[PDB]
Amino acid sequence: SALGKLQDVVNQNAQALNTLVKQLSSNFGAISSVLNDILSRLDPPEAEV
Amino acid sequence: ASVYAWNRKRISNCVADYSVLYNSASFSTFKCYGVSPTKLNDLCFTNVYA
Amino acid sequence: DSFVIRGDEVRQIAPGQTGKIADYNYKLPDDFTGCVIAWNSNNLDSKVG
């Protein structure tokens, strides 16, 4: 644990990137989190929503 | 069947042409909810029930 | 734009509708602005034969 100050910054940046990548898996109230599924399932008036 | 004893039929292992359902004018209501009616020929499904 | 249709087909003169005269007779855009006007004309546009 001698080099914990640099490893803390590295872990925080990697964890922020992992959270930002993980946030793509959430649909945020939509029917799906995948854009291609929405674009292949729905007409543009509701796919727009 | 009547609505209290509604009949459930499984649909599986078939290729389905929904365009004969879209192009028929015999249906008074043809309303789809989770999918566009015109995209039904472009997708693959399982657990299809009538 | 004036035309004559059936009584059940008046729901298809609208943006974002799926239907028959919407596809092959008269299509409205998704960004359509204006008013659709419909009234019964059984006394004028109908014959007993």
mmCIF file of N, CA and C in Angstrom:
data_model
loop_
_atom_site.group_PDB
_atom_site.id
_atom_site.type_symbol
_atom_site.label_atom_id
_atom_site.label_comp_id
_atom_site.label_asym_id
_atom_site.label_seq_id
_atom_site.Cartn_x
_atom_site.Cartn_y
_atom_site.Cartn_z
ATOM 1 N N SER A 1 0.809 -1.211 0.000
ATOM 2 C CA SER A 1 0.000 0.000 0.000
ATOM 3 C C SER A 1 0.846 1.267 0.000
ATOM 4 N N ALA A 2 2.104 1.170 -0.430
ATOM 5 C CA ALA A 2 2.974 2.340 -0.474
ATOM 6 C C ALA A 2 2.546 3.303 -1.572
ATOM 7 N N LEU A 3 2.117 2.769 -2.713
ATOM 8 C CA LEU A 3 1.770 3.561 -3.890
ATOM 9 C C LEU A 3 0.266 3.752 -4.012
ATOM 10 N N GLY A 4 -0.428 3.924 -2.886
ATOM 11 C CA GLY A 4 -1.878 3.975 -2.907
ATOM 12 C C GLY A 4 -2.450 5.246 -3.492
ATOM 13 N N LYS A 5 -1.671 6.330 -3.513
ATOM 14 C CA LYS A 5 -2.185 7.600 -4.015
ATOM 15 C C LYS A 5 -2.345 7.581 -5.531
ATOM 16 N N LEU A 6 -1.395 6.972 -6.244
ATOM 17 C CA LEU A 6 -1.526 6.841 -7.693
ATOM 18 C C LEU A 6 -2.568 5.796 -8.059
ATOM 19 N N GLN A 7 -2.586 4.686 -7.314
ATOM 20 C CA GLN A 7 -3.528 3.608 -7.580
ATOM 21 C C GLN A 7 -4.960 4.038 -7.300
ATOM 22 N N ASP A 8 -5.153 4.975 -6.367
ATOM 23 C CA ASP A 8 -6.480 5.519 -6.100
ATOM 24 C C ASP A 8 -6.999 6.293 -7.307
ATOM 25 N N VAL A 9 -6.142 7.110 -7.927
ATOM 26 C CA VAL A 9 -6.530 7.876 -9.110
ATOM 27 C C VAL A 9 -6.819 6.950 -10.286
ATOM 28 N N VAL A 10 -5.975 5.926 -10.471
ATOM 29 C CA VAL A 10 -6.174 4.957 -11.551
ATOM 30 C C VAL A 10 -7.480 4.189 -11.361
ATOM 31 N N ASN A 11 -7.759 3.762 -10.124
ATOM 32 C CA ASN A 11 -8.981 3.020 -9.834
ATOM 33 C C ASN A 11 -10.220 3.890 -9.992
ATOM 34 N N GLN A 12 -10.144 5.164 -9.588
ATOM 35 C CA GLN A 12 -11.275 6.072 -9.763
ATOM 36 C C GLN A 12 -11.576 6.324 -11.236
ATOM 37 N N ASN A 13 -10.538 6.515 -12.058
ATOM 38 C CA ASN A 13 -10.772 6.748 -13.482
ATOM 39 C C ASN A 13 -11.316 5.501 -14.175
ATOM 40 N N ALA A 14 -10.775 4.325 -13.836
ATOM 41 C CA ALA A 14 -11.265 3.082 -14.426
ATOM 42 C C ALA A 14 -12.688 2.772 -13.976
ATOM 43 N N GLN A 15 -13.018 3.093 -12.725
ATOM 44 C CA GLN A 15 -14.366 2.865 -12.223
ATOM 45 C C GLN A 15 -15.367 3.828 -12.852
ATOM 46 N N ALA A 16 -14.949 5.073 -13.112
ATOM 47 C CA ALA A 16 -15.811 6.013 -13.822
ATOM 48 C C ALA A 16 -16.079 5.562 -15.253
ATOM 49 N N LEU A 17 -15.047 5.060 -15.942
ATOM 50 C CA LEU A 17 -15.247 4.501 -17.280
ATOM 51 C C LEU A 17 -16.154 3.276 -17.256
ATOM 52 N N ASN A 18 -15.986 2.404 -16.257
ATOM 53 C CA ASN A 18 -16.820 1.210 -16.164
ATOM 54 C C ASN A 18 -18.273 1.564 -15.877
ATOM 55 N N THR A 19 -18.506 2.580 -15.044
ATOM 56 C CA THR A 19 -19.865 3.049 -14.788
ATOM 57 C C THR A 19 -20.487 3.659 -16.040
ATOM 58 N N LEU A 20 -19.701 4.431 -16.798
ATOM 59 C CA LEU A 20 -20.212 5.043 -18.023
ATOM 60 C C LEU A 20 -20.550 3.992 -19.077
ATOM 61 N N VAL A 21 -19.754 2.924 -19.157
ATOM 62 C CA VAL A 21 -20.071 1.826 -20.070
ATOM 63 C C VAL A 21 -21.293 1.052 -19.577
ATOM 64 N N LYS A 22 -21.396 0.849 -18.259
ATOM 65 C CA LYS A 22 -22.511 0.114 -17.665
ATOM 66 C C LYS A 22 -23.839 0.844 -17.839
ATOM 67 N N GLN A 23 -23.809 2.178 -17.902
ATOM 68 C CA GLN A 23 -25.034 2.962 -18.059
ATOM 69 C C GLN A 23 -25.705 2.775 -19.417
ATOM 70 N N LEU A 24 -25.002 2.223 -20.410
ATOM 71 C CA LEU A 24 -25.637 1.888 -21.679
ATOM 72 C C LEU A 24 -26.596 0.712 -21.570
ATOM 73 N N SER A 25 -26.437 -0.143 -20.564
ATOM 74 C CA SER A 25 -27.317 -1.291 -20.403
ATOM 75 C C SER A 25 -28.677 -0.929 -19.821
ATOM 76 N N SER A 26 -28.865 0.303 -19.360
ATOM 77 C CA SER A 26 -30.135 0.724 -18.789
ATOM 78 C C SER A 26 -31.026 1.313 -19.872
ATOM 79 N N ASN A 27 -32.306 0.949 -19.833
ATOM 80 C CA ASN A 27 -33.265 1.429 -20.818
ATOM 81 C C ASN A 27 -33.892 2.770 -20.465
ATOM 82 N N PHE A 28 -33.783 3.199 -19.200
ATOM 83 C CA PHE A 28 -34.293 4.485 -18.699
ATOM 84 C C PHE A 28 -35.790 4.647 -18.948
ATOM 85 N N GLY A 29 -36.542 3.561 -18.791
ATOM 86 C CA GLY A 29 -37.968 3.588 -19.019
ATOM 87 C C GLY A 29 -38.414 3.202 -20.412
ATOM 88 N N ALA A 30 -37.491 3.037 -21.355
ATOM 89 C CA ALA A 30 -37.862 2.606 -22.692
ATOM 90 C C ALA A 30 -38.083 1.095 -22.726
ATOM 91 N N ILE A 31 -38.534 0.606 -23.884
ATOM 92 C CA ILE A 31 -38.823 -0.817 -24.020
ATOM 93 C C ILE A 31 -37.544 -1.644 -24.076
ATOM 94 N N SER A 32 -36.439 -1.058 -24.529
ATOM 95 C CA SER A 32 -35.184 -1.786 -24.617
ATOM 96 C C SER A 32 -34.028 -0.806 -24.504
ATOM 97 N N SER A 33 -32.877 -1.325 -24.088
ATOM 98 C CA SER A 33 -31.660 -0.531 -24.026
ATOM 99 C C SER A 33 -30.854 -0.576 -25.316
ATOM 100 N N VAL A 34 -31.258 -1.392 -26.284
ATOM 101 C CA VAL A 34 -30.556 -1.525 -27.554
ATOM 102 C C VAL A 34 -31.266 -0.664 -28.588
ATOM 103 N N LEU A 35 -30.504 0.194 -29.269
ATOM 104 C CA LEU A 35 -31.095 1.093 -30.255
ATOM 105 C C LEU A 35 -31.539 0.351 -31.508
ATOM 106 N N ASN A 36 -30.798 -0.689 -31.899
ATOM 107 C CA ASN A 36 -31.145 -1.448 -33.095
ATOM 108 C C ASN A 36 -32.443 -2.220 -32.919
ATOM 109 N N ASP A 37 -32.719 -2.696 -31.702
ATOM 110 C CA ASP A 37 -33.977 -3.385 -31.430
ATOM 111 C C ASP A 37 -35.165 -2.444 -31.570
ATOM 112 N N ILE A 38 -35.032 -1.217 -31.067
ATOM 113 C CA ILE A 38 -36.094 -0.226 -31.194
ATOM 114 C C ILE A 38 -36.276 0.182 -32.652
ATOM 115 N N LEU A 39 -35.172 0.388 -33.374
ATOM 116 C CA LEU A 39 -35.262 0.791 -34.772
ATOM 117 C C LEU A 39 -35.765 -0.324 -35.679
ATOM 118 N N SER A 40 -35.614 -1.583 -35.276
ATOM 119 C CA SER A 40 -36.131 -2.699 -36.052
ATOM 120 C C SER A 40 -37.513 -3.160 -35.608
ATOM 121 N N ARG A 41 -37.985 -2.729 -34.442
ATOM 122 C CA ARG A 41 -39.299 -3.135 -33.963
ATOM 123 C C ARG A 41 -40.397 -2.112 -34.198
ATOM 124 N N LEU A 42 -40.086 -0.820 -34.250
ATOM 125 C CA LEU A 42 -41.114 0.207 -34.155
ATOM 126 C C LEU A 42 -41.102 1.164 -35.340
ATOM 127 N N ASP A 43 -42.278 1.731 -35.611
ATOM 128 C CA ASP A 43 -42.403 2.838 -36.542
ATOM 129 C C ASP A 43 -41.756 4.089 -35.950
ATOM 130 N N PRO A 44 -41.258 4.993 -36.798
ATOM 131 C CA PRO A 44 -40.573 6.214 -36.313
ATOM 132 C C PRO A 44 -41.394 7.122 -35.399
ATOM 133 N N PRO A 45 -42.747 7.217 -35.495
ATOM 134 C CA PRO A 45 -43.451 8.012 -34.460
ATOM 135 C C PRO A 45 -43.298 7.524 -33.021
ATOM 136 N N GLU A 46 -43.259 6.216 -32.769
ATOM 137 C CA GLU A 46 -43.035 5.748 -31.404
ATOM 138 C C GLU A 46 -41.580 5.392 -31.127
ATOM 139 N N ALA A 47 -40.827 5.015 -32.167
ATOM 140 C CA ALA A 47 -39.390 4.839 -32.009
ATOM 141 C C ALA A 47 -38.715 6.160 -31.686
ATOM 142 N N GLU A 48 -39.293 7.277 -32.139
ATOM 143 C CA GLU A 48 -38.795 8.594 -31.762
ATOM 144 C C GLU A 48 -38.919 8.817 -30.259
ATOM 145 N N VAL A 49 -40.035 8.384 -29.666
ATOM 146 C CA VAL A 49 -40.231 8.521 -28.223
ATOM 147 C C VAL A 49 -39.262 7.628 -27.451
ATOM 148 N N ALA B 1 -64.009 -19.916 -28.741
ATOM 149 C CA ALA B 1 -64.434 -20.086 -27.363
ATOM 150 C C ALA B 1 -64.968 -18.778 -26.786
ATOM 151 N N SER B 2 -65.644 -18.894 -25.648
ATOM 152 C CA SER B 2 -66.139 -17.729 -24.940
ATOM 153 C C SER B 2 -64.989 -17.061 -24.189
ATOM 154 N N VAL B 3 -65.244 -15.848 -23.695
ATOM 155 C CA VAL B 3 -64.158 -15.040 -23.152
ATOM 156 C C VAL B 3 -63.726 -15.504 -21.760
ATOM 157 N N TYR B 4 -64.598 -16.174 -21.002
ATOM 158 C CA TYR B 4 -64.165 -16.711 -19.716
ATOM 159 C C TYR B 4 -63.305 -17.956 -19.894
ATOM 160 N N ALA B 5 -63.495 -18.685 -20.994
ATOM 161 C CA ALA B 5 -62.713 -19.879 -21.294
ATOM 162 C C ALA B 5 -61.954 -19.744 -22.608
ATOM 163 N N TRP B 6 -61.258 -18.618 -22.790
ATOM 164 C CA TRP B 6 -60.592 -18.291 -24.050
ATOM 165 C C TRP B 6 -59.524 -19.314 -24.431
ATOM 166 N N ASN B 7 -59.491 -19.657 -25.717
ATOM 167 C CA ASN B 7 -58.661 -20.742 -26.225
ATOM 168 C C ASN B 7 -57.274 -20.214 -26.568
ATOM 169 N N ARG B 8 -56.244 -20.883 -26.060
ATOM 170 C CA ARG B 8 -54.857 -20.498 -26.293
ATOM 171 C C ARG B 8 -54.180 -21.548 -27.161
ATOM 172 N N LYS B 9 -53.703 -21.132 -28.331
ATOM 173 C CA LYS B 9 -53.039 -22.022 -29.272
ATOM 174 C C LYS B 9 -51.579 -21.624 -29.408
ATOM 175 N N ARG B 10 -50.689 -22.609 -29.343
ATOM 176 C CA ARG B 10 -49.267 -22.357 -29.511
ATOM 177 C C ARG B 10 -48.906 -22.317 -30.990
ATOM 178 N N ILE B 11 -48.085 -21.341 -31.362
ATOM 179 C CA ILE B 11 -47.556 -21.202 -32.715
ATOM 180 C C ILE B 11 -46.045 -21.337 -32.623
ATOM 181 N N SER B 12 -45.501 -22.362 -33.275
ATOM 182 C CA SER B 12 -44.068 -22.607 -33.241
ATOM 183 C C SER B 12 -43.665 -23.405 -34.471
ATOM 184 N N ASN B 13 -42.399 -23.225 -34.873
ATOM 185 C CA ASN B 13 -41.755 -23.927 -35.991
ATOM 186 C C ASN B 13 -42.516 -23.686 -37.302
ATOM 187 N N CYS B 14 -42.612 -22.410 -37.669
ATOM 188 C CA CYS B 14 -43.282 -22.024 -38.901
ATOM 189 C C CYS B 14 -42.677 -20.717 -39.390
ATOM 190 N N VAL B 15 -42.802 -20.468 -40.692
ATOM 191 C CA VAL B 15 -42.492 -19.165 -41.269
ATOM 192 C C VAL B 15 -43.801 -18.428 -41.534
ATOM 193 N N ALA B 16 -43.905 -17.218 -40.998
ATOM 194 C CA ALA B 16 -45.167 -16.500 -40.932
ATOM 195 C C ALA B 16 -45.133 -15.285 -41.846
ATOM 196 N N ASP B 17 -46.132 -15.187 -42.716
ATOM 197 C CA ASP B 17 -46.323 -14.044 -43.603
ATOM 198 C C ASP B 17 -47.417 -13.191 -42.976
ATOM 199 N N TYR B 18 -47.011 -12.138 -42.275
ATOM 200 C CA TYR B 18 -47.968 -11.227 -41.668
ATOM 201 C C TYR B 18 -48.511 -10.216 -42.667
ATOM 202 N N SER B 19 -47.942 -10.165 -43.875
ATOM 203 C CA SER B 19 -48.416 -9.232 -44.885
ATOM 204 C C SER B 19 -49.810 -9.594 -45.383
ATOM 205 N N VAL B 20 -50.225 -10.863 -45.280
ATOM 206 C CA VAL B 20 -51.612 -11.191 -45.611
ATOM 207 C C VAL B 20 -52.571 -10.798 -44.500
ATOM 208 N N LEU B 21 -52.050 -10.458 -43.324
ATOM 209 C CA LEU B 21 -52.836 -9.947 -42.213
ATOM 210 C C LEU B 21 -52.930 -8.433 -42.313
ATOM 211 N N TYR B 22 -51.822 -7.793 -42.703
ATOM 212 C CA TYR B 22 -51.831 -6.346 -42.901
ATOM 213 C C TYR B 22 -52.660 -5.953 -44.118
ATOM 214 N N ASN B 23 -52.506 -6.667 -45.240
ATOM 215 C CA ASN B 23 -53.176 -6.266 -46.474
ATOM 216 C C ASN B 23 -54.642 -6.673 -46.542
ATOM 217 N N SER B 24 -55.136 -7.489 -45.614
ATOM 218 C CA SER B 24 -56.556 -7.805 -45.592
ATOM 219 C C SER B 24 -57.338 -6.674 -44.942
ATOM 220 N N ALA B 25 -58.420 -6.267 -45.595
ATOM 221 C CA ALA B 25 -59.275 -5.198 -45.109
ATOM 222 C C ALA B 25 -60.437 -5.733 -44.288
ATOM 223 N N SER B 26 -60.463 -7.043 -44.036
ATOM 224 C CA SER B 26 -61.561 -7.660 -43.301
ATOM 225 C C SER B 26 -61.512 -7.374 -41.808
ATOM 226 N N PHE B 27 -60.363 -6.971 -41.279
ATOM 227 C CA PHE B 27 -60.216 -6.741 -39.850
ATOM 228 C C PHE B 27 -60.577 -5.292 -39.553
ATOM 229 N N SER B 28 -61.525 -5.097 -38.631
ATOM 230 C CA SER B 28 -61.910 -3.745 -38.241
ATOM 231 C C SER B 28 -60.829 -3.085 -37.399
ATOM 232 N N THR B 29 -60.154 -3.856 -36.554
ATOM 233 C CA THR B 29 -59.088 -3.331 -35.715
ATOM 234 C C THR B 29 -57.860 -4.202 -35.912
ATOM 235 N N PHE B 30 -56.745 -3.570 -36.272
ATOM 236 C CA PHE B 30 -55.466 -4.258 -36.444
ATOM 237 C C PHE B 30 -54.454 -3.349 -35.750
ATOM 238 N N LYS B 31 -54.239 -3.589 -34.460
ATOM 239 C CA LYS B 31 -53.486 -2.671 -33.615
ATOM 240 C C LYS B 31 -52.391 -3.420 -32.869
ATOM 241 N N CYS B 32 -51.141 -3.050 -33.114
ATOM 242 C CA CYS B 32 -49.992 -3.686 -32.486
ATOM 243 C C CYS B 32 -49.373 -2.734 -31.471
ATOM 244 N N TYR B 33 -48.790 -3.296 -30.409
ATOM 245 C CA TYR B 33 -48.382 -2.496 -29.262
ATOM 246 C C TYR B 33 -46.870 -2.446 -29.092
ATOM 247 N N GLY B 34 -46.213 -3.589 -28.949
ATOM 248 C CA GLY B 34 -44.784 -3.590 -28.734
ATOM 249 C C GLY B 34 -43.954 -3.710 -29.989
ATOM 250 N N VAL B 35 -44.584 -3.649 -31.161
ATOM 251 C CA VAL B 35 -43.898 -3.896 -32.421
ATOM 252 C C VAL B 35 -44.687 -3.197 -33.520
ATOM 253 N N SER B 36 -43.984 -2.729 -34.545
ATOM 254 C CA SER B 36 -44.674 -2.171 -35.695
ATOM 255 C C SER B 36 -45.309 -3.291 -36.516
ATOM 256 N N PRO B 37 -46.486 -3.054 -37.103
ATOM 257 C CA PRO B 37 -47.112 -4.085 -37.950
ATOM 258 C C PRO B 37 -46.327 -4.417 -39.207
ATOM 259 N N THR B 38 -45.612 -3.451 -39.780
ATOM 260 C CA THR B 38 -44.886 -3.695 -41.018
ATOM 261 C C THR B 38 -43.511 -4.309 -40.797
ATOM 262 N N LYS B 39 -43.031 -4.368 -39.559
ATOM 263 C CA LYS B 39 -41.744 -4.981 -39.261
ATOM 264 C C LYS B 39 -41.866 -6.451 -38.903
ATOM 265 N N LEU B 40 -43.092 -6.982 -38.858
ATOM 266 C CA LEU B 40 -43.320 -8.355 -38.426
ATOM 267 C C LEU B 40 -42.741 -9.372 -39.400
ATOM 268 N N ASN B 41 -42.601 -9.006 -40.673
ATOM 269 C CA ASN B 41 -41.968 -9.885 -41.646
ATOM 270 C C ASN B 41 -40.448 -9.888 -41.551
ATOM 271 N N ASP B 42 -39.857 -8.968 -40.792
ATOM 272 C CA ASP B 42 -38.410 -8.836 -40.708
ATOM 273 C C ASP B 42 -37.825 -9.395 -39.416
ATOM 274 N N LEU B 43 -38.654 -9.903 -38.511
ATOM 275 C CA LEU B 43 -38.213 -10.362 -37.202
ATOM 276 C C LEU B 43 -38.501 -11.844 -36.999
ATOM 277 N N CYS B 44 -37.781 -12.420 -36.042
ATOM 278 C CA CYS B 44 -37.929 -13.811 -35.645
ATOM 279 C C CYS B 44 -38.469 -13.848 -34.221
ATOM 280 N N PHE B 45 -39.404 -14.763 -33.970
ATOM 281 C CA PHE B 45 -40.084 -14.849 -32.688
ATOM 282 C C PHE B 45 -40.122 -16.279 -32.170
ATOM 283 N N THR B 46 -40.336 -16.376 -30.863
ATOM 284 C CA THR B 46 -40.753 -17.600 -30.200
ATOM 285 C C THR B 46 -41.799 -17.205 -29.169
ATOM 286 N N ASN B 47 -42.449 -18.223 -28.594
ATOM 287 C CA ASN B 47 -43.612 -18.078 -27.709
ATOM 288 C C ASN B 47 -44.729 -17.274 -28.362
ATOM 289 N N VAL B 48 -45.103 -17.676 -29.573
ATOM 290 C CA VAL B 48 -46.198 -17.022 -30.271
ATOM 291 C C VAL B 48 -47.476 -17.720 -29.837
ATOM 292 N N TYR B 49 -48.461 -16.946 -29.403
ATOM 293 C CA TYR B 49 -49.720 -17.506 -28.938
ATOM 294 C C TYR B 49 -50.896 -16.740 -29.515
ATOM 295 N N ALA B 50 -51.914 -17.466 -29.962
ATOM 296 C CA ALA B 50 -53.134 -16.862 -30.478
ATOM 297 C C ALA B 50 -54.237 -17.131 -29.466
ATOM 298 N N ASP C 1 -57.304 19.423 -49.579
ATOM 299 C CA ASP C 1 -57.306 18.134 -50.264
ATOM 300 C C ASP C 1 -58.636 17.453 -49.967
ATOM 301 N N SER C 2 -59.474 17.320 -50.990
ATOM 302 C CA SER C 2 -60.835 16.818 -50.848
ATOM 303 C C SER C 2 -60.965 15.433 -51.467
ATOM 304 N N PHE C 3 -61.611 14.518 -50.742
ATOM 305 C CA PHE C 3 -61.911 13.184 -51.252
ATOM 306 C C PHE C 3 -63.069 12.604 -50.446
ATOM 307 N N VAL C 4 -63.534 11.426 -50.868
ATOM 308 C CA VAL C 4 -64.631 10.712 -50.220
ATOM 309 C C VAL C 4 -64.174 9.302 -49.866
ATOM 310 N N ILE C 5 -64.345 8.921 -48.598
ATOM 311 C CA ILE C 5 -63.927 7.614 -48.099
ATOM 312 C C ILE C 5 -65.073 6.994 -47.306
ATOM 313 N N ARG C 6 -64.811 5.855 -46.668
ATOM 314 C CA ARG C 6 -65.791 5.187 -45.826
ATOM 315 C C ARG C 6 -65.852 5.840 -44.446
ATOM 316 N N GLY C 7 -66.772 5.348 -43.613
ATOM 317 C CA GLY C 7 -66.892 5.858 -42.258
ATOM 318 C C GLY C 7 -65.866 5.326 -41.281
ATOM 319 N N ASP C 8 -65.390 4.098 -41.482
ATOM 320 C CA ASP C 8 -64.362 3.542 -40.610
ATOM 321 C C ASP C 8 -62.946 3.933 -41.017
ATOM 322 N N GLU C 9 -62.772 4.511 -42.200
ATOM 323 C CA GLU C 9 -61.468 4.903 -42.716
ATOM 324 C C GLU C 9 -61.071 6.322 -42.328
ATOM 325 N N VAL C 10 -61.916 7.038 -41.580
ATOM 326 C CA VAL C 10 -61.586 8.400 -41.171
ATOM 327 C C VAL C 10 -60.518 8.441 -40.083
ATOM 328 N N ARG C 11 -60.261 7.324 -39.400
ATOM 329 C CA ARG C 11 -59.148 7.278 -38.460
ATOM 330 C C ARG C 11 -57.798 7.202 -39.161
ATOM 331 N N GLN C 12 -57.770 6.811 -40.436
ATOM 332 C CA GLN C 12 -56.511 6.679 -41.158
ATOM 333 C C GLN C 12 -56.011 7.989 -41.755
ATOM 334 N N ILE C 13 -56.819 9.045 -41.748
ATOM 335 C CA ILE C 13 -56.357 10.375 -42.195
ATOM 336 C C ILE C 13 -55.779 11.068 -40.967
ATOM 337 N N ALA C 14 -54.525 10.724 -40.652
ATOM 338 C CA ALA C 14 -53.822 11.198 -39.467
ATOM 339 C C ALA C 14 -52.334 10.899 -39.606
ATOM 340 N N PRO C 15 -51.462 11.697 -38.982
ATOM 341 C CA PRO C 15 -50.039 11.331 -38.918
ATOM 342 C C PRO C 15 -49.806 10.070 -38.100
ATOM 343 N N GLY C 16 -48.828 9.281 -38.540
ATOM 344 C CA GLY C 16 -48.368 8.119 -37.802
ATOM 345 C C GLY C 16 -49.336 6.963 -37.729
ATOM 346 N N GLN C 17 -50.304 6.896 -38.640
ATOM 347 C CA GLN C 17 -51.278 5.817 -38.671
ATOM 348 C C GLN C 17 -50.817 4.704 -39.595
ATOM 349 N N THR C 18 -51.152 3.478 -39.217
ATOM 350 C CA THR C 18 -51.072 2.334 -40.105
ATOM 351 C C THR C 18 -52.463 1.983 -40.616
ATOM 352 N N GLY C 19 -52.561 1.717 -41.912
ATOM 353 C CA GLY C 19 -53.850 1.618 -42.565
ATOM 354 C C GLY C 19 -53.701 1.520 -44.068
ATOM 355 N N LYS C 20 -54.850 1.501 -44.741
ATOM 356 C CA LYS C 20 -54.907 1.078 -46.135
ATOM 357 C C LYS C 20 -54.884 2.258 -47.100
ATOM 358 N N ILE C 21 -55.801 3.214 -46.918
ATOM 359 C CA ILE C 21 -55.796 4.432 -47.720
ATOM 360 C C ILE C 21 -54.656 5.345 -47.304
ATOM 361 N N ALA C 22 -54.119 5.144 -46.096
ATOM 362 C CA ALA C 22 -52.924 5.863 -45.678
ATOM 363 C C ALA C 22 -51.717 5.434 -46.500
ATOM 364 N N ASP C 23 -51.622 4.146 -46.826
ATOM 365 C CA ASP C 23 -50.473 3.646 -47.568
ATOM 366 C C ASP C 23 -50.644 3.784 -49.077
ATOM 367 N N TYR C 24 -51.818 3.454 -49.620
ATOM 368 C CA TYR C 24 -51.967 3.355 -51.067
ATOM 369 C C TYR C 24 -52.870 4.415 -51.682
ATOM 370 N N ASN C 25 -53.502 5.276 -50.888
ATOM 371 C CA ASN C 25 -54.343 6.319 -51.463
ATOM 372 C C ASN C 25 -53.921 7.727 -51.068
ATOM 373 N N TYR C 26 -53.699 7.987 -49.781
ATOM 374 C CA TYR C 26 -53.451 9.350 -49.311
ATOM 375 C C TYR C 26 -52.623 9.287 -48.035
ATOM 376 N N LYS C 27 -51.379 9.754 -48.097
ATOM 377 C CA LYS C 27 -50.461 9.694 -46.965
ATOM 378 C C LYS C 27 -50.198 11.099 -46.440
ATOM 379 N N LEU C 28 -50.269 11.257 -45.117
ATOM 380 C CA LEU C 28 -49.924 12.444 -44.348
ATOM 381 C C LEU C 28 -48.544 12.297 -43.717
ATOM 382 N N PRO C 29 -47.743 13.360 -43.684
ATOM 383 C CA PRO C 29 -46.413 13.265 -43.077
ATOM 384 C C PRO C 29 -46.484 13.241 -41.556
ATOM 385 N N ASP C 30 -45.367 12.829 -40.953
ATOM 386 C CA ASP C 30 -45.279 12.779 -39.496
ATOM 387 C C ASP C 30 -45.252 14.173 -38.879
ATOM 388 N N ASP C 31 -44.695 15.156 -39.590
ATOM 389 C CA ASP C 31 -44.683 16.552 -39.166
ATOM 390 C C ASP C 31 -45.822 17.365 -39.776
ATOM 391 N N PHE C 32 -46.972 16.738 -40.010
ATOM 392 C CA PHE C 32 -48.108 17.425 -40.613
ATOM 393 C C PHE C 32 -48.722 18.428 -39.642
ATOM 394 N N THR C 33 -48.980 19.637 -40.136
ATOM 395 C CA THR C 33 -49.744 20.643 -39.414
ATOM 396 C C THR C 33 -50.975 21.045 -40.220
ATOM 397 N N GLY C 34 -52.088 21.236 -39.522
ATOM 398 C CA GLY C 34 -53.350 21.526 -40.163
ATOM 399 C C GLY C 34 -54.487 20.801 -39.476
ATOM 400 N N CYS C 35 -55.622 20.748 -40.173
ATOM 401 C CA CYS C 35 -56.859 20.172 -39.659
ATOM 402 C C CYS C 35 -57.476 19.249 -40.698
ATOM 403 N N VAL C 36 -57.959 18.098 -40.238
ATOM 404 C CA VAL C 36 -58.726 17.168 -41.060
ATOM 405 C C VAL C 36 -60.206 17.365 -40.752
ATOM 406 N N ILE C 37 -61.025 17.423 -41.799
ATOM 407 C CA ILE C 37 -62.445 17.748 -41.682
ATOM 408 C C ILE C 37 -63.223 16.584 -42.269
ATOM 409 N N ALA C 38 -64.190 16.067 -41.513
ATOM 410 C CA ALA C 38 -65.022 14.969 -41.982
ATOM 411 C C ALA C 38 -66.465 15.175 -41.552
ATOM 412 N N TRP C 39 -67.390 14.937 -42.479
ATOM 413 C CA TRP C 39 -68.813 14.974 -42.181
ATOM 414 C C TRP C 39 -69.535 13.941 -43.034
ATOM 415 N N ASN C 40 -70.660 13.455 -42.513
ATOM 416 C CA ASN C 40 -71.434 12.420 -43.188
ATOM 417 C C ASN C 40 -72.120 12.988 -44.425
ATOM 418 N N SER C 41 -72.059 12.238 -45.522
ATOM 419 C CA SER C 41 -72.651 12.635 -46.797
ATOM 420 C C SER C 41 -73.431 11.477 -47.409
ATOM 421 N N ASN C 42 -74.238 10.802 -46.587
ATOM 422 C CA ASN C 42 -75.083 9.724 -47.089
ATOM 423 C C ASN C 42 -76.262 10.241 -47.903
ATOM 424 N N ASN C 43 -76.685 11.485 -47.674
ATOM 425 C CA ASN C 43 -77.786 12.067 -48.430
ATOM 426 C C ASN C 43 -77.380 12.505 -49.830
ATOM 427 N N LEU C 44 -76.089 12.707 -50.079
ATOM 428 C CA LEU C 44 -75.605 13.214 -51.357
ATOM 429 C C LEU C 44 -74.802 12.199 -52.154
ATOM 430 N N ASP C 45 -73.893 11.466 -51.514
ATOM 431 C CA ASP C 45 -72.968 10.582 -52.218
ATOM 432 C C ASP C 45 -73.406 9.124 -52.176
ATOM 433 N N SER C 46 -74.710 8.860 -52.219
ATOM 434 C CA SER C 46 -75.205 7.495 -52.160
ATOM 435 C C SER C 46 -76.452 7.385 -53.024
ATOM 436 N N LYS C 47 -76.633 6.210 -53.620
ATOM 437 C CA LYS C 47 -77.807 5.896 -54.420
ATOM 438 C C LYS C 47 -78.375 4.553 -53.986
ATOM 439 N N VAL C 48 -79.688 4.395 -54.173
ATOM 440 C CA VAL C 48 -80.363 3.168 -53.762
ATOM 441 C C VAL C 48 -79.924 1.990 -54.637
ATOM 442 N N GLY C 49 -79.602 2.241 -55.909
ATOM 443 C CA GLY C 49 -79.029 1.213 -56.756
ATOM 444 C C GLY C 49 -77.535 1.029 -56.622
#
